[PDB]
Each structure stands twice: as C-alpha cells, then as structure tokens.
Design a protein around this ligand. Structure first.
Ligand SMILES: Nc1ncnc2c1ncn2[C@@H]1O[C@H](COP(=O)(O)OP(=O)(O)OP(=O)(O)OP(=O)(O)OP(=O)(O)OC[C@H]2O[C@@H](n3cnc4c(N)ncnc43)[C@H](O)[C@@H]2O)[C@@H](O)[C@H]1O
Ligand SMILES: Nc1ncnc2c1ncn2[C@@H]1O[C@H](COP(=O)(O)OP(=O)(O)OP(=O)(O)OP(=O)(O)OP(=O)(O)OC[C@H]2O[C@@H](n3cnc4c(N)ncnc43)[C@H](O)[C@@H]2O)[C@@H](O)[C@H]1O
Ligand SMILES: Nc1ncnc2c1ncn2[C@@H]1O[C@H](COP(=O)(O)OP(=O)(O)OP(=O)(O)OP(=O)(O)OP(=O)(O)OC[C@H]2O[C@@H](n3cnc4c(N)ncnc43)[C@H](O)[C@@H]2O)[C@@H](O)[C@H]1O
Ligand SMILES: [K+]
Ligand SMILES: [K+]
Ligand SMILES: [K+]
Lengths: 489, 6, 489, 489, 6, 6, 6
C-alpha cells in the first residue's frame, strides 16, 4: 500500500494533498454512519507529526463549526509536509491546538479520534505516547482510529508495547494485515475500508486478500440438474483408532454435508461401526488391525480403496506411534491422488514425502502441529504468513494454518479467513473441516479453492448457531453447514 | 447532515 | 438480621418505630403490585403481640380509609413497645380490633394479612394459634405473610407443627434461610424482599446468599476471540461400568456443553464405544478391565491420562464394590489435580484421603450419599447447611449438597441455589452437573465459582424445557444448557 | 396542612420523625417512577435548615449505596430537631455533606434535589440562596423539588424574587395553592401528591380542592331513557348587538352541546338571523331595537320570553352603553329565575341588584371584568381566591373567575380548575362557557355544580383539539365538547 | 393509587 | 429496584 | 458501496 500511495502520486499524478483530504473526510463520514448526527458530540483529536496526524488535522478541520467542540492535541516533534499543510489549515479555519496532554482533558470530550501513529509506526511505544494511549483506553470514551489503531504493527497485527483499543477503525484502500491478524484485529473494533482515490487496478494488484462472501459464492460448484452420485465425486477418509473412534464420523459428514456424492471411511474394527450407527448414509469399512491402529499391514488394503475415489483425507484420530508413522508415509508416497492431511497424519509426516509426490496435497495444521512440523516454537509460527508461504512453495502444497484467523496459502496467493467464533475451539471442529475440504476437491475445486470455500463456510456455520457459542459442538456444526451454504446465495 | 443539506 | 436490626437502631440511630413503619408500608406496596388497586378488597389482619404483629398494625392503619374494610384480630397476650405504639395508632385512626376469632369471620374478607409470628417463633404452634392457621389454610382466601409465614422457623425452613401457606411473603432486608429451604420455601409463595432502611454495608455483611443471575453473569468466563482448544481447558472423566454405560456420556457432554475445549472419558471396554456413538466429539478411551469395573490394575493408566488434563471428574456409573473402592482411594491420594467427586466415588470414599490431598476437590452428593458419607440419617443431613459447612472446612473442599434447593459451601461462604424443577428428579441429571462443574474448573474458575455457576445453569436449563417438566430427560437438558447461558446475558 | 401535620402529631400521635421519613422515601419512589432505575445517576441534594431540608436529608440517606454518587450541600444556618436528627443519620450512614457551594459543582451531577425551602418560606430569596437557585435554573440538569419549588409561596403561587424551576415536584397530603396557581404551577413541573400517613379524615377536611375527572363524572346529570326535550331543560340567552352578532351563536351552542333540550336566543334584528344560518337547531328571536342594542324598551318582551325557561344567560356581545346598563339592571332586578351573567352584563352591573335578588346567579368574569366590577387593579384581583370568596359570600352568588387556572367559589367552597391550554385565549371562548353553565343549570345542577362541571369540560375540550392549540377557535371547541363528555366516562 | 395522586 | 428485590 | 467496503 505505501507502494500504492507512491504510484498514485508519482506515476498517476494525484496530489498527495488530495489523497490526504479524501482520507480525512472518509473518517468523518464513517463516524457519521456509526454515531448518527455528529453535531451533539465533542471531539478530541490526537495527532502525531506524520501523515496519520495530517489525516487527523483534516478530520479536525471538517468538524469545525459543525459539532459541539473540537480540540486537537498535537503530540509530535515535527510535521511532515502534508501534516504541516493541514495543521496550517486547521489553524486558519479557527481550530484550537494544544501540545500538552492533561489526564483530565478526556472529561470534557465524547469522542477521541486517534491519529497518532499509522503504518509508519517503527518499534515500541514508550513515554508520554504510551501514557496518553493508556489514559484513552481507561476513559470509556468512544474511540475512532485513523488507518490502524496506534500501536498496532500494520504488517503483523502485533502490539508494540501498548496500543489503542478502537470502537471503529477507518482505513484506506485495503485492509492491512494488522487489522486481520490478532491481537490487532481485536483492537480495530469495527473496520471500514474507504476508497480515497487510488486507481482500481492498483487496489486489485494486492496479493493477500480477506476471503469474502462474494468470492466463496463465485467458487461454489454447480449442481447441474442431470446429475448422479458420481457427478459430485468420491472421497475416502482414512481415520480413527481404538482411542479415537469419533473423528472419522465428523470428517465423513463434513464431506457429505458439503454435497459430495460418496464418502467411504476406513476405520479399525469395530470402531468403524460407530459411524454408521450415527449416520448410516456413510460407508464405514472395517480395517483389521493388530492393536487398534493402522500400520503397514493395512497399506495394500488402503491403496486399493483409494483406486475408486477422487480424493483421500488422512489423519483424524489415527494416533501417533511408530507403526502409524510408517503407514502414513509409505501411503502418501504411493498414493497418486490428491491428499488432505490433518492431525496425526501431520504429526508423523516426513516432509521429503510431500516433495516427491506428483499428486497435490492440502495440509491443515493448527499452530501446535505447524510448530512440530517445521521444528519451531508455537510463537514463531502463529500468524506467520511468510513462513506458511515458504512452506507451501517449498513443498508444493496448500497450507491451511488454522486459528481465529486462518491463513490459506499456496506460496503465490495468500488468503485470510475471518469467519468463526470461539465455539470452534473444541475437539471435533478440525475434523469437520478436513471433510469439507476433501469434499470440495472431490467436486472439482482445486486444492486452494476447496480450502478457501471450506474455511469460510466452516466459520460461517459456527456463527449461525442459535444459542451461546461456547455450547457449540461439532455435531451441531455439521447441521448448520447447509444453512451456511444457503445463506451464501 | 455533514455532507448534504436537502 | 436480628443483629442487623439491632446495629441499625443502637449504633446507626434509626428509631425502631421508623424501621417498623417502613416495613408495614412495604407490605402495602407489595400487595398493591400483586393485586392491583387495593380499594375493592376487604382485609383481615391477624396480629400477634410481637414486632411481627406491630408490622401488621402498621399495615392495618395504612389501609384505613383506602380500602373497603379492615379488621384486626389480635391474638397476643401482651404487646411489645413498638407493637403497642402501633396498636395505639390503629385505634386512634379509627380501626376496629377484636380479640376473639370466629371460624366464619373469614367469610366477610377477601385478603388475610398474616402477622402472627415472624422470626421470633420459638417452638411448636399449638392451641388457637394453630386452629386459626388451619382455618386460614382452609379458606381459599388470598394470604399475605409478613416477614415469614407464621409457623416457618426462619433459620431452618421447618414447619413448627403447623404453618401458614402464603400466596405472597414480604420480608425485610434479606431473604431468610426459611424462605429458601423447604418446606418453608413452598409456604412462602411469591417472595418480595423490601429495603426498610438498613445501611447497605450491613445488608451486604450477610454471609449466606442466594445465587442470582447477576452473580452467575459476573462469574462466567471470558471467551477471548484469539483462542484455541487449550485456552478453554481439558477434562478427564473416569466413569461407567458394564452396569452403567450411560453416565460417562452425560458427564462428558456436560463439560463440553459449558464451553470446555477437550473432554476425555475413561470407560471400560466396550462400553466406552457407547459415548462416541452418541457424541463423536468426545474422546472415549477404552480401559481394559477384568470384570467390567475399574480396579487397581487400571490405576497407572488413569494417572497417566490425568497428566495432560486440568481437572478430573470421577464417580458416575463406576459401581460400588471393594475393587472400585481401592482404585478410587488410591487414585485420589495420588492425583495432583483438582478432582470433582460424584456418585459411586463418593459411596466408597475414605475421607482421610481428602484431608491428605494438596489439590482441591468438589464433592457433589445428594442427601442419600451425604448421609452414608458422614454416617448419619438422611433426615439429619437434608438441608443441614451447618453440617455441610463443617464437612467442607474439615476436609478442605467444596461441598455441593444437591436437592430442590442446593447448598454450595466451602466452609466460609455458603450459597443457595433455587433454580430447577422436578424434571431434574430422574437419573442422569446429576451426571450432567458433574461435567458442568469439571468443565468450569477447566476454564479457570475456582472450585467454588465453578460449582456456583454450574448449579445455577443446570437448574435454569431445566426451566427452559418447552413441554411439561416431568418429561425432561438428561439428554434434553444437555441441549438446553447453551440456551441457559445465552439467556444469562 | 401545617394544621394537619400538627394534629397528626399532637392528637393522633404519629411521631414527627415518621412523617419525615415517609416524605423522604416518597420523593425517592417518585423519582424512580419518573427516571426509571436510579442507580446510574449522581444526585446533588440542596438542604436548608428547616423541615424541608430534613426531608432532603432523608432522601439523601436513602440513595446512599444505591446510586452512583450523592452529595448534600447544606445551606442553612441552624437545623430544626427533625432536620438535625436526619442530618445525624445521613452522616452516620457515610454521607458526604459540604456547606460551601461552588458554581462548577453542578458539572459532576445529573439530578439536583431541591430541599432548600418548603411551606416555611417567609419573604424574598436574596443572597447566596438566590445565586444557588439561579445557578440550578441555568444548569440544564433534572430538578426534583421537595414539597414546593423553593421560592414559590405555597399560599399564593407567587415567586418570592427567585424560584426553582422543577421538572418534578413531590408534595405531601394535598396539592398546595402554590402548585395550582401561576406562576407557581409553571415552576412545579410534573406534580405528584404523596400520602405520608395523615389520617384520611383530615386530608378530606381541606376546603379548597382541585376539580378532578372523578368529581365531574359524579356530577354529570343522568340521561334517563324515557325523556323528552323538557326533561333536559330550557335556556334563554339574551345577547348580541349590531357590533357583536357572533356571541349569541357560540353561547347558544354551548348550551345545546352539553345536552340542554331547548335554547332560545334573544338577539337584535337582523343579527338574530346569523345564528340560525349557522345552527338552525337554535331558536333566535328577533328583538326590535332603536340603534342595534337592547334597551329598556325591550324589557317587557324579555321578561316574557323568560317565563317559559329555567335559566337565563345574559351579557355576551351586548355592548356597554347607558341604555344597555338600564336594561340589564332593571332586567336582573325583576327576573325570578337563575341568571348566568357574563361579559358586558358584568361591565354595567350594579352589585346592589345581586343582593336584592331571591333567585341565584353565576358571574363569570375574566380578571379585567373583575377588576372593574370591584374597582381594583387587575393585579389585585388576579388569582385572588380570598377576594373571590368574599365577593360570592357578600353577593350570594357563585363567582367563576376565569384564567389559566379558574377559581369557582360560592363563599364556602372554593374549587380550582386546571384543564385547558392557550387556545382558549381568544374571543368566543368565554361565550361558549356561559352557555355550558346555563345549560347545566337548566338540567338541574346547582349553580356551583353547573359551574364546576362546565369549566372542567370547557378546558378538557380544548385539550382534545388534534392540531396545535394556537389554531383553536370557539367553533372547533363546540365540536369537541361531546368528545370531552364521552371521555369523562 | 395508595402512595400517589397524579 | 429501590424498594424490592424479587 | 462507492466509499466503503465493510
Ligand atoms: O513513510 P512513513 O512510514 O514514515 O509514513 P508516516 O510517517 O506518514 O506514518 P506515521 O504517521 O505513522 O508516522 C509516525 C511517525 O511517528 C514517529 N514514531 C514511529 N514510531 C514511534 C514510536 N515507537 N514512539 C514515538 N514515535 C514514533 C516516527 O517519526 C514516525 O515516522
Ligand atoms: O426478638 P424476638 O425473637 O422476640 O422478635 P419478635 O418478638 O418481635 O418476633 P415475633 O413477633 O415473632 O414474636 C412472637 C412472640 O409470640 C410468642 N410465641 C413464640 N412462639 C410461640 C408459639 N410457639 N405459640 C404461641 N406463642 C408463641 C412469643 O412470646 C414470641 O416472642
Ligand atoms: O413551621 P415552618 O413554617 O417554619 O416550617 P419549616 O421551617 O419546616 O419549613 P422550611 O423548611 O421552609 O423552613 C425554611 C427556613 O428557612 C429560612 N428562610 C425562610 N425564608 C427565607 C428567605 N427568604 N431567605 C433565607 N432564609 C429563609 C427560615 O428560617 C425558615 O424557617
Ligand atoms: K492511528
Ligand atoms: K407472619
Ligand atoms: K423545596
């Protein structure tokens, strides 16, 4: 985006003062839309010396004479050319500025506009900038942040020692990674993206996007009326163990609930019988095992079952021991079908095997599993989209790195999913998602498309739960899926 | 109110 | 409270006549709120010689000239100073008193105000006091009791030979134990608590409280958006047997339905498979047993399973035999995790083991199990909050003593739960509650907080059943839980 | 009332501290009813040294611990015994008092309770009491006055240099004259009358009352089904002149619209024809005059027309010249029928004639006409109920002294009407009222009853106008009358 | 009705 | 709320 | 739609 500001100025010829004005007045219209008529409020605008503060000066000037009271507190040491220009205008229009912050100055205002730091935040907020932000966070006033809540790193969504907690954030052109990833997404409050005059070609040239309803609607496969089971594809799920008899059922219904024609489960006997007692629409093939877990002795049976299907999901409830490790790795090495790889299949995976496969793969790790898979700490991999990108690119796969915001990348294209709620923070929830992905690949979506549609609908089904989210279980989620799909259209 | 008088 | 009346008079300086007046007029406003306009009714006020009768005299005087008819029947032998003062006023305002009760006098009145005995009831009601109360209970008239229905012991909720059955009871300052415990809670009818001028500090200094919606709302844990399974904690449930395959499932879903991230059941094979056929979101680990019950040979496996969890629930459906007894007691002695102890784990428990544990425990007995645990009769332990308090204090635990009103104590703080209905009077209902408690401890609530929130929501889920309560089953209750939680907020 | 406080204490035996408490808590309940839940507000209670301030102390104490903040500013020099007692309690319950008022102290509070002066206001408010009242009137805060807005004389409704403008006033026992008469009625805002424990016999022994819906409902005459024209009486209206052809029509329809069976107008020719062109239900008898006005030559004709009727109204539009003066006075001297005397009949009236009449009379002056009739200034007679009382008593009549609050007296009984709005402040409005009174006397109400019912319905018809009151005309008012009557029942 | 006349 | 807890 | 994406 800083690159897109530059090109719109330097190559397209838009005066930077014009971009600055459009930004400021965007903030005013966005506040009007949220608060209704602005004339009864008193505004405290906090302005740094950079262009974010310049945007604030523009905001402050456009409230002059229209609202109860305005006051700019200027916190910077020096002003950029556009901030100076706009400070010059605020003052000529009759605006009050001060350069001293008093703890009790919040008492006299209803709304605080936070235009201290934007995308030009480098390093940690200390000193009076911090005291001021802490004071605003304590005040209970309505906070509107310009571009990004000051103190959010707009590339990572990390808090640089302290950050403003906004009720509304108005950003320009496109959402920034820091609005989308946590903790920054939490501090952004309600996000509005204002068009401030950038040519549409540049806005679209951005290469990381949020997954939207319109995008998932345009990727949903067609259901032509003259169709049969086979039109909508076949999936094999290799899953479960004597410890984890539940996973296969949730995965298998994940696939069916998204419109797959046939799902075959391969689960050790007698645990295979669990699935068909819940959902007799499933096929649940008993695999004979020595101790209740898959091993190399089941390799040939499973490649055979894989001949008649379009995609294979593997991992949920398999268990993690040396015999499962041999079996999964020999299996994926030999399977010449798209693989969706989850849970324990990820925990025992040899990444050399992903390289040597001609057929595609989606991996769906949570950050715990990602940490173990690349031999890093959870904190190093969590919300790390560049690492996810290198992993996908180096291993020729799609990586779906699950969290409150999920990253879906293939190494070139990176998408962020923001649907969902904390009800997905319990067991079985990932098992549903593995199914949904496998099912959509079976219906002819590519691995990346399959993954994009699935994370979105998975999250959206959670939001449709009618009672409190914390009571949501994977079984209820399965029921909500077709509602999520209906509501897409 | 801010942008338009009707 | 008698202590709080005294302090408000003696230290704070409120004239006792002023407390008496505020009480009386509270009763009048409370009746107005329940009956609408009072002017069409005829009132029969029954007054003892104590301060409860004085409150009645105040009521009677404040209806003079406003209603169709008033008559006080005075039943006492002598009057206290404030009762005498207020009798003096009734008479000077023109009120009719009589000191003889005729069976047919009820025929001429619509409402009976019962101001015979309050908190100063000592011993059994015999003689004409009883005949009068029986006569009122037979009359089908609307009865309003002042403070407590005469004949309820306000410390125990016991009926002292006979007691008034009220449609409305208006009490002062705080609910009294006798309004909250049965049978007194049944005879209170609709309870209103009037503020009659006691300083708020004293009202709050009371140390036994009823559990309220606001209190459970303020204890419900946060669901921060950037969360994962582990944020919301892990529970292990040790439960079931070849006789009782159902308990584990109801407990396990108890935990999940309150927002726990992970629940692992440990149930003897093949009964473990029952749970995942109902709810495949659960993990149900098969335990190899000799005869279908846990014993010491499963001790090591179970301590191992306990390493990865935050709380362990134990007891539902275990069975009660010598091998289960060895196993439970050796287990709890060695487990260095919070334990929730229910059902058969309680029936075989050695209380020396609770003493020697560093880790906390909640016990959730019904009065049958409490009787056996302390070697007393059911009648000695039922609704006995002081016994429950000593047990918790002596054994460093939280005791949840279940009944239509449930007592939750830790020895210092005692709470009463009054939500629920008779649909919870069938098997499986306690098994759900054990789960809910374990789940809330897993999410970071203390044992006492966990227990307080759980008994309330458990009861409130029962009340939300849409059909007749007697048809409620534990499975439906599990479904209602997240509605109970939503309706809290 | 001061007399009724004394009797309830001294003869009935109610402790004055108990009356004081009931008053205070009345104020709290009244504020709750108006503001909803009080716990979010901050209260500034302004307390004098008298019993009004004592009522305030009681209010302040009963908010302690229940609301956001309380502060009493004590403005008195010394305290009465009950104010001191209650100040003593506020302080013991933990309440903050201060004795210094700072202009900016209003900034920290939402509600101001005005308990500075009540009925014990003697003389003008000067000094810091005034500065404080002016400051409160400027603040835009919600004001609740205890008993009477401080600075209103509770006997006259006059402003003693300055007075508090209240949103709500809570008074005790009965409304006071100062709430009912202007300017005090304007400063009272919404008035609530609290019962604080006075015996009903004394409350009812008060001899000046406000006219209420229930009282007018119980005085409305019966319409027995087997009735004819004559059942509902006959009225003659002597009115109009070549200058004022409109008055007769409005009077005549006043009478008919309230249910009179027959109305005959006597109006100089050809102006008599005006009435029947508007309303042909009227009878409009042409009187032959020399110059367009009644004179003695029409005396005999008019006594003849008066033989067949029950009541005669005289005055509207007659004109005021010597010939009208002779005619009216000779007429009333000889008429042996009830007379309703309005407008120009009042302006030329000889009061010796009212004395010498056996038959009754109602006079319906506005203060201009009253001033001229007793030879005083408008300011001396306006809202002067004692003067009105002596006039009625000395002249054996009913006096209806019209104004925004109308006084209706017969010398023993004095009633105040408070229905109406400023739309009645235009010509024709009084002419309707004269008719209504005459009509109700015709239907068998006594002069005082007739007058009481009429002023109430006249005012209530104005309030039912569907558009802005300032556009109300006498013709529309005539149309609204039967709606006013329907809405009574 | 009992406490207030309006 | 001021007078009664229900 | 023209000014804001939500
Ligand atoms: O190109 P830029 O990245 O400099 O953009 P900008 O300066 O316009 O953006 P910003 O207003 O955030 O510029 C903010 C400015 O504030 C200052 N600033 C950045 N980080 C901190 C910090 N951690 N503490 C105090 N001041 C800071 C810098 O001078 C920065 O350029
Ligand atoms: O202090 P207190 O406990 O005496 O309070 P109180 O006398 O004001 O309360 P009460 O009105 O119930 O006082 C009631 C009074 O009624 C009498 N009373 C208590 N119990 C009985 C009973 N069982 N039968 C007949 N009279 C009784 C006692 O004198 C008692 O103090
Ligand atoms: O019998 P009272 O008429 O004295 O009744 P009260 O003193 O209780 O009534 P109040 O509180 O108004 O008493 C108010 C008191 O305030 C004082 N006061 C009365 N009028 C004024 C005034 N005009 N300026 C200052 N103080 C006044 C008097 O001491 C008066 O008694
Ligand atoms: K900012
Ligand atoms: K009682
Ligand atoms: K006052």
């Amino acid at each position: 985006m800083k690159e897109i500001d530059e090109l719109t100025i330097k190559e397209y010829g838009v005066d930077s003062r014009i971009l600055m004005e459009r930004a400021g007045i965007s903030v005013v219209l966005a506040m009007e839309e949220e608060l209704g008529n602005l004339s009864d409020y008193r505004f405290l605008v906090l302005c740094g010396g950079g262009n974010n503060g310049g945007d604030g000066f523009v905001v402050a000037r456009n409230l002059l004479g229209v609202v109860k009271d305005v006051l700019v507190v200027f916190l910077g040491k020096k002003k950029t050319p556009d901030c100076e220009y706009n400070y010059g205008l605020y003052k000529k229009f009759g605006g009050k500025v001060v350069e001293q912050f008093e703890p009790s100055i919040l008492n006299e205002f209803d709304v605080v506009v936070d235009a201290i730091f934007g995308t030009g935040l480098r390093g940690e907020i200390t000193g009076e900038y911090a005291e001021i932000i802490n004071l605003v966070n304590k005040s209970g006033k309505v906070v509107v942040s310009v571009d990004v809540p000051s103190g959010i790193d707009s590339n990572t969504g990390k808090v640089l020692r302290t950050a403003v907690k906004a009720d509304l954030t108005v950003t320009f052109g496109v959402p920034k990674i820091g609005h989308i990833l946590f903790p920054g997404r939490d501090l952004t409050g309600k996000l509005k993206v204002a068009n401030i005059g950038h040519p549409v070609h540049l806005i679209n040239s951005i290469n990381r996007y949020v997954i939207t309803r319109e995008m998932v609607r345009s990727l949903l496969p067609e259901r032509p009326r003259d169709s049969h089971k086979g039109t909508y594809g076949k999936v094999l799920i290799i899953a479960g163990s004597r410890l984890y008899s539940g996973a296969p059922v949730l995965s298998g219904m994940g696939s069916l609930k998204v419109g797959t024609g046939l799902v075959k489960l391969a689960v050790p006997f007698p645990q295979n019988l669990i699935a068909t007692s819940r959902f007799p629409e499933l096929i649940s093939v008993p695999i004979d095992t020595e101790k209740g877990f898959f091993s190399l002795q089941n390799l040939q049976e499973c490649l055979e079952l894989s001949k008649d299907v379009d995609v294979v999901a593997i991992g949920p409830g398999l268990g993690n021991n040396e015999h499962v490790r041999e079996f999964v790795n020999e299996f994926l090495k030999t399977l010449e079908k798209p693989a969706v790889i989850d849970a324990d299949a990820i925990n025992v995976l040899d990444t050399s095997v992903l390289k040597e496969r001609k057929s595609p793969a989606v991996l769906t790790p949570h950050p715990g599993e990602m940490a173990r898979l690349v031999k890093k700490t959870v904190g190093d991999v969590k919300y790390n989209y560049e690492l996810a990108e290198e992993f996908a690119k180096e291993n020729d796969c799609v990586l779906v790195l699950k969290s409150a915001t999920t990253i879906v990348t293939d190494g070139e294209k990176t998408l962020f999913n923001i649907t969902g709620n904390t009800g997905l923070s319990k067991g079985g929830s990932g098992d549903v998602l593995t199914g949904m992905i496998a099912g959509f690949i079976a219906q002819g979506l590519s691995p990346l498309e399959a993954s994009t549609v699935s994370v979105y609908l998975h999250g959206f089904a959670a939001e449709l739960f009618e009672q409190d989210e914390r009571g949501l279980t994977a079984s209820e989620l399965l029921r909500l899926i077709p509602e999520a799909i209906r509501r897409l259209k | 109110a801010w942008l338009f008088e009707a």
